[PDB]
Design a protein. Structure first.
Lengths: 711, 88, 318, 218
C-alpha cells in the first residue's frame, strides 16, 4: 500500500528472493533488511526521502499479515551534467549522446530528467567509447561525482576526464594458432595508411575473426588484442593473439516446445546436419528458416558442450508454438429471404503436419460458394511443394426462371513448387475452369468482350447465355527473406503469379500479378518499422479475343486501399437500354431500362479492369498502451494507400461524353490508422481511413473490420 | 531434377592429409583422439574399431567420401590403419 | 455436454497405454555382442496384482483426522489410532459413547469395563460412489503411554451386497468412522469453548500505545474475536461504515460519512479529521490486547495526533 | 468469496463438492481451508485433496507444484507413493492433446520431454515402493512410455535416412540399441542402420547388422 510507481508484481518477486512468501514463516530479523533493500531501490531510481516501513499484525492461530507502507517522495531531477577536462570536444556534443538528460526541449514531451545508476554507468561507457573511437587511445575517466541538493530534488552529475593525445594505427600484427586460415584473417585485419586508432573497429575485427573461425567448426576460440602504445610518435600497434582451439562436431540436434508440430517439420528446415562438424552460420540459417516459417512465436538456439568431451556439442532449438489459423464466420440474412451461413477455416500447420489446409464457403438462397485447398510444403525432401485447389461458385437468384443473371462456375487447380535458391522458389501448375453465364444485363464492357469472343447478343433483351471451358498453365515465383512469419520487422517478400490459356481453351488470354512487401527497421530494437507494400496486375487477350471480364482486377478494401468499399475502385458499368425483361414493380432495375430512360446512362456498379496498380506506405509503431509481454501479439501502424484500376480496352473515341476509364491518372488515395491483433480466431485487423482523394462513384467506408491475414 | 536446390549435406568428421599422417601404429587411443579428434562413429558390437568417415555432398555434384578405419586391441593400442581415399 | 457419475473416480485420459506391445529382448548372434545397455530406461519386474486402467481409484487416500486433539493419529492397514489431549481420565469412554449415540449407531457387544465395543452394520452415503458401501467396526479406548487413545478396526466392507477386499476402501472407511467420531468429539469441545468465550465478557478500554513498527494503534484490551466483532459497530457510530472486511486477514475498509459536532460528542470521542477518501484498518490478536491500525487513502499511516482525537474515549461506541 | 465458517464446516463443504464432482468450487474451498489454517489437523488431507482436484481440473502446473510441496514437506508420509503416482499421471497428461487425439494422430513425433519426465517419475515410484497398489499401472505406463520414446528416436532416424545423413542415422540407431533394446521401434530401426552402413560402403558393419536382424527376424 502507498506505492505509486513500483508495481506490486516487482515488489512481490523481491519478497520471494528474501524468503518472505505466503505460507512460510516470518523471519523478523530480515525485516530491516528487506526495508533497507527497497529503500535502496527507491534511491537508485532517484526517489530520495522515500520510506518503506513494514507493519506486522498478529492474526489468530499464530499467523501474521505483512503490510508494506510505501511513502514515496518527489523524484529528483538532474540539474546539470558537467564534464571537466574536455578540450577537443564540447560538453553539449558529448552529452547529446547520453541517456541521462540535463534538459528537455519544450517540444519533446516523451523524456524527463530522472536519474538511474545503471543509466549513469552505461553513460560513462558511452563517453569512453566516444573518446576511444576518435583515436585517443588514452582517454581516462579520472573520477565521477554524483551530488545532491540539500532538499534532495536537485541531483548533480560531474565527470572528470583526461583526453590524452590522438594516436594512429601503425599496423595490426596477428599471431598465434590460426588453424591454417591465416590468409583469410589478414584480409580482416587490413588498415588504411595513417588511419586513426579506433576501439570499435578493433572490437569489430575481433568479432569478425571469431565468426570466421566459427564458420569452420572452431566454436570456442580466444581472440585478445593488446595494443602497444608509443608516445614518441603517437602511434599504436595492435597485437591480435588468436587461438582457434579444437574443431567441434554436432552430436545431436534437439527440439523443445514443439508440443503440436511434428519433429520432422522442424528438422527439415535445418542446414546443420546432426553427425557433422559444426558451422555457426548453418545453425543461424536454421534458426532464421524456423523463424521465417511462421509456426512459432519465438525461436531460440542453445549450443551446449557435451559433458566430458572436448569436441562435441548439442544444438537445442527452443520454440514457442503459435496459433496458425483463422476461423472467419458470420451470418448475413438470418430470416430475410431464407437462411445463410459462412465458413472460413484456414490452417497453415494442420495438426502440426505442416500441411496448409483452407476450406471456406458461403451458402445462401442464391449462392453456393465452396472452396477447398490442400498443399504439402514438402512433397519431396528438398522442399518440392504439391498443392491443389477445388472451387465451385453458383449464382441462381432463387427464381428458377429467366432474367436472373445466372452464373455457375467451378474449376480445379494443381500446383508444383520447388526452390532454386535459399530464398527463391518457382511454381508451375495446371488449372481448369468452367464458366456459364446467362441472362446478362447489357453493358458496354461486357458486350465488347462478348463481341471480341464472336458472340452477338441482343442489346435490348436480357435473353442470352455463354459457356466457356478454359485450361490454363499457371506459373509463379516467390522471393522470401522476411525476418519473421507473421509480424516481420526486416526483409522483403516478392510474389509473382500468372496464368496463360493453353491452346484448346474457349477463350485465349494471359494474366500476371506481382505483390511486394518490404520492411525496413529504423530502430535498432526493430520496434519502429517502415513497410512499403505494392501490388501490380496486367492481363489481356492473345488473339482477336479479350480477357474475360470475370478475371478483372478489383481494388479498394481492407487489403488494397483502406477507406474504400470492397471492390469499388475502377471502371463503372454503363448499361444499354433494355426495352424488355423489365419488372415495373421491382424498382431495382438500373437507369438503362424500359421503366427508365433509353440512353447509355452510366451507373455506379464497379466492374474492375484489366490493369491494376496499388501502393502503400506504412509506419509501424509500438502500441501506445500495452504490456511488453504482449508486444508481439498486437501491431499498430499509420498507413497511406494509393490505388488505381483502369480498362486499357475502353474506347474513348466512342462514348466520348462518358468518363474515360482507360486513363491511369485517376489515383485514389487514403490515410488513417490500423491495428492488428492476433486473437484466438486468427488475425483481426481494425482500420480507420479517410479517402481524401476519390472520384465519382467511389463508395467510401471509413471503418473496416477484417478476419485473417490481409496480405 | 538437377534444378531443385539442395543444400550441402556434410557428414562425418573433417580429415586432412597432415592429420591422417600424424597417426601411426602403436599409438594409444588417447593419442589418436588428440591427433584426429573424437570419432563420430565406432563399432558398437564386439570390436574396438574407430571409423573416421568424411562425407561431402555439395548437391548435384557427386558424393566424395574418405573413410579411415582404426582397429585397436584390447589394451587400446592402435594395431591397423586402413585408409580408403575415395568411394568404389 | 453429456457426463456420467464414473468420470469422478477415473483418470483424465484413455486406456490406450494398456494396449502397448510387450517388450521382448534381442538375441545376440554368435561371434559378436550387442551394445551394452544404458540401464536408464530399465523397467523393474513387479507383480501385476493391483488394478489397472479405469479400475484403479486415484481418489486420495483417507488420512485419519486429529480433530478432537492435536496428538498423534495414524492408520495401519485395517486399524486407525488417535491420541487425545492428555488422557481425560476415565471420561474418554463415556464421551466417545455419547458421540457414538449422537448418530444413533447400533451397538451389539459392550465392554465398558474393558473399554471395547462392536457396531452393527452401518450405511454410508457418498455421491462419489456409484454403489453405497457398508461394513462393521470395533471401537476401543486404551492407553498408549502417558495418554489415552481411541482405536477403530474395520471388520469388513460390502458394496452391491458383495464382500470387498481392496485396501483402498478399507482405509477410506476406517478413516471415515474415525473422523466421524473425532468430529463429534471436536464439535462438543468447540461448542463448550464457544460457550465459555461468550460467557467471558471482556473490557472495552482503548489505548494509543505503539508497537515495534513505531506507529500508534487504537489498541483495545481484548481478544481478537470480540474486538473484531464490536469494531464494525464502533466504526458505524463514528460514521465510518464498513464495506469490506476479512476476519482471517484482519484488513477492513470504511467509507466517509459526515457527522457534526453534536454527533461526535454523542459517540466516537470526537473528530480525528479524517474527512476524505476510503480508509483501511487492521486488527491484531493478543488474547488480552488488540491493535487497531489506520491508513490514509493515499496509502500512508495516520500520525499520533490524527488518531489521538478518537482515543479520548473510543469506548462507548464499541 | 469463501465464508469464514468454522474449519469443520469448510472441510465438509469441500468434501461434498469433491463428491459431487464440481472441481472448481471444491478447489476454492480447499484453498481457503489451507491458506486460513496452514498447519492443522486438515493439512495433509487438504493437500492431497488439492492435488487430486488440480489433476481432475486440468490445472496440471498447479498439481505439479502441490506435489512438489507435499513431497518436500512430508518426505516420509505413509501415502507418499500415491503422490509419486499422481506426479507421473500429471506428466503423462502434459504429453497429450485432445484435438490431435480426435483425429487419430500418432503423437510419438512430438516433444518427448514430458514423456521422459513421466517415465522418470513412474520408475521412481516402482523402484521405491514395489508393493504399492499403483505399481501395476505404473509398470504398464512405463512400458507404454518406453515404446513411445523409442518411436520418437525411430522417427528421427527415419527422417535422417530420407535426408541422406547416414552418420546421423547410424548414431541414432546405436543410441536406440543402447537405450531401448527391447522395444519394437528398435527392431524396425535395425534395417535403417544396415542401409546407412551400406550407403557409406562399410560392408562389414552392414553384414553384422544383417546378422543381428536375421537372428531376430520376428
Amino acid at each position: 500500500s502507498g506505492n505509486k510507481s513500483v508495481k506490486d508484481d516487482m515488489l512481490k518477486q523481491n519478497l520471494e528472493a528474501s524468503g518472505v512468501r505466503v505460507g512460510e514463516s516470518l523471519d523478523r530479523t530480515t525485516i530491516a533488511d528487506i526495508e533497507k533493500g527497497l529503500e535502496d531501490f527507491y534511491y537508485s531510481v532517484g526517489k530520495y526521502s522515500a520510506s518503506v516501513k513494514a507493519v506486522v499484525t498478529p492474526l489468530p492461530r499464530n499467523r501474521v499479515d505483512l503490510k508494506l507502507v510505501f511513502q514515496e517522495g518527489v523524484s529528483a531531477e538532474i540539474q546539470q551534467i558537467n564534464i571537466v577536462g574536455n578540450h577537443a570536444f564540447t560538453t553539449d556534443e558529448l552529452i547529446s549522446h547520453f541517456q541521462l538528460r540535463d534538459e528537455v526541449p519544450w517540444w519533446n514531451v516523451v523524456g524527463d530528467r530522472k536519474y538511474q545508476k545503471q543509466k549513469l554507468a552505461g553513460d560513462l561507457e558511452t563517453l569512453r567509447s566516444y573518446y576511444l573511437d576518435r583515436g585517443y587511445a588514452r582517454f581516462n575517466i579520472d573520477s565521477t561525482q554524483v551530488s545532491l541538493t540539500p532538499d534532495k530534488k536537485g541531483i548533480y552529475v560531474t565527470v572528470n576526464i583526461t583526453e590524452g593525445d590522438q594516436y594512429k594505427l601503425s599496423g595490426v600484427e596477428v599471431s598465434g594458432n590460426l588453424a591454417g586460415h591465416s590468409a583469410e584473417i589478414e584480409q580482416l585485419t587490413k588498415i588504411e595508411p595513417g588511419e586513426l586508432y579506433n576501439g570499435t573497429k578493433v572490437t569489430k575485427m575481433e568479432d569478425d575473426i571469431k565468426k570466421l573461425l566459427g564458420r569452420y567448426g572452431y566454436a570456442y576460440p580466444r581472440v585478445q588484442s593488446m595494443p602497444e602504445i608509443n608516445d614518441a610518435d603517437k602511434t599504436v600497434k595492435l597485437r591480435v593473439n588468436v587461438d582457434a582451439g579444437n574443431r567441434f562436431y554436432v552430436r545431436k540436434i534437439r527440439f523443445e516446445g514443439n508440443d503440436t508440430s511434428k519433429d520432422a517439420v522442424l528438422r527439415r528446415e535445418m542446414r546443420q546436419m546432426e553427425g557433422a562438424w559444426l558451422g555457426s552460420d548453418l545453425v543461424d540459417q536454421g534458426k532464421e528458416r524456423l523463424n521465417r516459417l511462421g509456426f512459432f512465436e519465438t525461436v531460440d538456439t542453445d549450443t551446449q558442450r557435451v559433458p566430458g568431451s572436448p569436441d562435441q556439442v548439442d544444438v537445442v532449438y527452443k520454440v514457442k508454438e503459435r496459433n496458425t489459423g483463422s476461423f472467419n464466420f458470420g451470418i448475413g440474412y438470418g430470416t430475410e429471404s431464407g437462411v445463410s451461413f459462412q465458413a472460413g477455416v484456414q490452417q497453415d500447420n494442420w495438426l502440426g503436419t505442416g500441411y496448409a489446409v483452407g476450406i471456406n464457403g458461403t451458402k445462401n438462397d442464391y449462392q453456393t460458394y465452396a472452396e477447398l485447398s490442400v498443399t504439402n510444403p514438402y512433397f519431396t525432401v528438398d522442399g518440392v511443394s504439391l498443392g491443389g485447389r477445388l472451387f465451385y461458385n453458383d449464382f441462381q437468384a432463387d427464381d428458377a426462371d429467366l432474367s436472373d443473371y445466372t452464373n455457375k462456375s467451378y474449376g480445379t487447380d494443381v500446383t508444383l513448387g520447388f526452390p532454386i535458391n535459399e530464398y527463391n522458389s518457382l511454381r508451375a501448375g495446371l488449372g481448369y475452369v468452367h464458366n456459364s453465364l446467362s441472362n446478362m444485363q447489357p453493358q458496354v464492357a461486357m458486350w465488347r468482350y462478348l463481341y471480341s469472343m464472336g458472340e452477338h447478343p441482343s442489346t435490348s433483351d436480357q435473353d442470352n447465355s455463354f459457356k466457356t471451358d478454359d485450361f490454363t498453365f499457371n506459373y509463379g515465383w516467390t522471393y522470401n527473406k522476411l525476418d519473421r512469419g507473421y509480424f516481420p520487422t526486416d526483409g522483403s517478400r516478392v510474389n509473382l503469379t500468372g496464368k496463360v490459356t493453353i491452346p484448346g481453351s474457349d477463350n485465349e488470354y494471359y494474366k500476371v500479378t506481382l505483390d511486394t512487401a518490404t520492411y525496413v527497421p529504423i530502430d535498432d530494437d526493430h520496434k519502429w518499422v517502415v513497410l512499403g507494400r505494392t501490388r501490380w496486375g496486367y492481363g489481356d487477350g492473345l488473339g482477336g479475343k479479350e480477357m474475360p471480364f470475370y478475371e478483372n482486377f478489383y481494388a479498394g478494401g481492407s487489403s488494397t486501399v483502406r477507406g474504400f468499399q470492397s471492390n469499388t475502385i475502377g471502371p463503372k458499368a454503363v448499361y444499354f437500354p433494355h426495352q424488355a425483361s423489365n419488372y415495373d414493380p421491382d424498382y431495382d432495375y438500373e437507369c438503362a431500362t424500359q421503366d427508365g430512360a433509353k440512353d447509355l446512362c452510366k451507373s455506379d456498379d464497379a466492374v474492375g479492369g484489366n490493369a491494376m496498380a496499388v501502393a502503400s506506405l506504412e509506419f509501424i509503431t509500438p502500441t501506445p498502451f500495452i504490456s511488453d509481454k504482449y508486444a508481439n501479439s498486437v501491431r499498430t501502424s499509420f498507413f497511406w494507400d494509393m490505388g488505381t484500376v483502369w480498362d486499357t480496352n475502353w474506347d474513348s473515341s466512342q462514348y466520348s461524353g462518358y468518363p474515360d476509364y482507360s486513363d491511369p491518372s485517376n489515383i485514389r488515395m487514403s490515410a488513417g490508422i490500423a491495428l492488428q491483433w492476433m486473437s484466438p480466431l486468427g488475425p483481426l485487423v481494425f482500420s480507420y481511413a479517410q479517402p481524401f482523394k476519390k472520384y465519382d462513384g467511389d463508395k467510401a467506408e471509413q471503418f473496416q473490420f477484417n478476419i485473417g491475414k490481409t496480405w | 531434377e538437377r534444378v531443385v536446390y539442395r543444400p550441402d549435406i556434410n557428414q562425418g568428421n573433417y580429415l586432412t592429409a597432415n592429420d591422417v599422417s600424424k597417426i601411426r601404429v602403436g599409438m594409444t587411443q588417447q593419442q589418436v583422439a588428440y591427433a584426429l579428434g573424437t570419432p563420430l562413429m565406432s563399432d558398437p558390437f564386439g570390436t574396438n574399431t574407430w571409423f573416421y568417415v568424411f562425407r561431402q555432398q555439395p548437391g548435384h555434384e557427386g558424393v566424395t567420401q574418405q573413410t579411415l578405419t582404426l582397429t585397436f586391441n584390447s589394451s587400446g593400442v592402435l594395431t591397423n590403419i586402413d585408409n580408403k581415399p575415395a568411394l568404389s | 455436454c453429456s457426463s456420467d457419475s464414473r468420470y469422478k473416480r477415473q483418470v483424465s485420459g484413455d486406456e490406450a497405454y494398456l494396449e502397448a506391445a510387450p517388450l521382448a529382448e534381442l538375441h545376440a548372434p554368435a561371434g559378436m555382442i550387442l551394445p551394452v545397455t544404458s540401464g536408464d530406461y530399465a523397467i523393474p519386474v513387479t507383480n501385476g496384482s493391483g488394478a489397472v486402467g479405469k479400475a484403479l481409484d486415484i481418489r486420495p487416500p483417507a488420512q485419519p483426522l486429529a480433530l478432537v486433539s492435536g496428538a498423534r493419529t495414524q492408520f495401519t492397514g485395517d486399524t486407525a489410532s488417535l491420541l487425545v489431549e492428555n488422557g481425560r481420565g476415565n471420561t474418554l469412554w463415556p464421551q466417545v459413547v455419547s458421540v457414538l449415540q449422537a448418530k444413533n449407531y447400533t451397538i451389539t457387544q459392550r465392554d465398558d469395563a474393558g473399554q471395547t465395543l462392536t457396531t452393527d452394520w452401518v450405511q454410508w452415503n457418498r455421491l462419489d460412489e456409484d454403489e453405497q458401501y457398508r461394513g462393521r467396526y470395533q471401537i476401543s479406548v486404551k492407553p498408549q503411554g502417558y495418554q489415552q487413545a481411541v482405536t477403530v478396526k474395520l471388520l469388513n466392507l460390502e458394496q452391491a451386497g458383495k464382500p470387498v477386499a481392496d485396501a483402498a476402501s478399507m482405509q477410506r472407511y476406517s478413516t471415515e468412522m474415525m473422523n466421524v467420531i473425532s468430529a463429534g468429539l471436536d464439535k462438543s469441545a468447540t461448542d463448550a469453548a464457544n460457550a465459555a468465550q461468550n460467557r467471558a465478557s471482556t473490557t472495552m478500554d482503548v489505548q494509543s500505545a505503539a508497537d515495534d513498527t513505531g506507529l500508534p494503534m487504537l489498541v483495545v484490551r481484548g481478544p481478537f474475536n470480540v474486538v473484531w466483532q464490536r469494531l464494525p459497530a464502533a466504526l458505524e457510530k463514528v460514521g465510518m461504515k464498513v464495506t469490506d472486511s476479512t476476519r482471517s486477514q484482519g484488513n477492513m475498509a470504511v467509507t466517509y460519512k459526515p457527522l457534526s459536532d453534536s454527533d461526535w460528542q454523542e459517540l466516537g470521542a470526537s473528530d480525528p479529521g479524517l474527512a476524505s477518501g476510503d480508509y483501511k484498518l487492521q486488527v491484531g490478536d493478543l488474547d488480552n490486547r488488540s491493535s487497531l491500525q489506520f491508513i490514509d487513502p493515499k496509502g500512508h499511516t495516520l500520525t499520533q495526533s490524527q488518531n489521538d482525537a478518537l482515543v479520548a474515549v473510543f469506548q462507548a461506541a464499541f | 468469496e469463501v465464508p469464514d465458517n468454522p474449519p469443520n464446516e469448510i472441510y465438509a463443504t469441500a468434501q461434498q463438492k469433491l463428491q459431487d464432482g464440481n472441481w472448481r468450487q471444491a478447489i476454492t474451498q480447499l484453498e481457503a481451508l489451507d491458506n486460513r489454517y496452514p498447519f492443522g489437523p486438515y493439512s495433509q488431507q487438504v493437500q492431497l485433496d488439492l492435488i487430486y482436484a488440480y489433476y481432475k481440473n486440468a490445472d496440471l502446473p498447479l498439481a505439479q507444484a502441490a506435489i512438489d510441496r507435499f513431497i518436500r514437506l512430508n518426505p516420509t508420509h505413509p501415502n507418499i507413493d500415491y503422490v509419486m503416482y499422481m506426479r507421473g499421471l500429471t506428466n503423462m497428461a502434459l504429453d497429450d492433446s485432445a484435438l490431435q487425439g480426435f483425429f487419430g494422430v500418432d503423437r510419438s513425433d512430438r516433444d518427448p520431454q514430458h514423456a521422459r519426465a513421466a517415465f522418470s517419475d513412474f520408475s521412481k515410484l516402482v523402484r521405491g515402493y514395489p508393493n504399492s497398489q499403483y505399481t501395476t499401472d505404473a509398470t504398464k505406463r512405463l512400458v507404454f512410455l518406453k515404446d513411445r520414446l523409442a518411436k520418437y528416436e525411430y522417427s528421427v532416424a527415419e527422417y535422417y535416412t530420407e535426408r541422406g545423413a547416414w552418420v546421423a542415422v547410424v548414431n541414432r540407431v546405436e543410441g536406440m540399441l543402447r537405450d531401448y533394446p527391447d522395444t519394437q521401434a528398435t527392431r524396425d530401426a535395425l534395417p535403417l542402420m544396415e542401409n546407412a552402413y551400406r550407403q557409406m560402403q562399410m560392408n562389414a558393419q552392414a553384414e553384422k547388422v544383417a546378422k543381428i536382424i536375421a537372428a531376430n527376424s520376428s
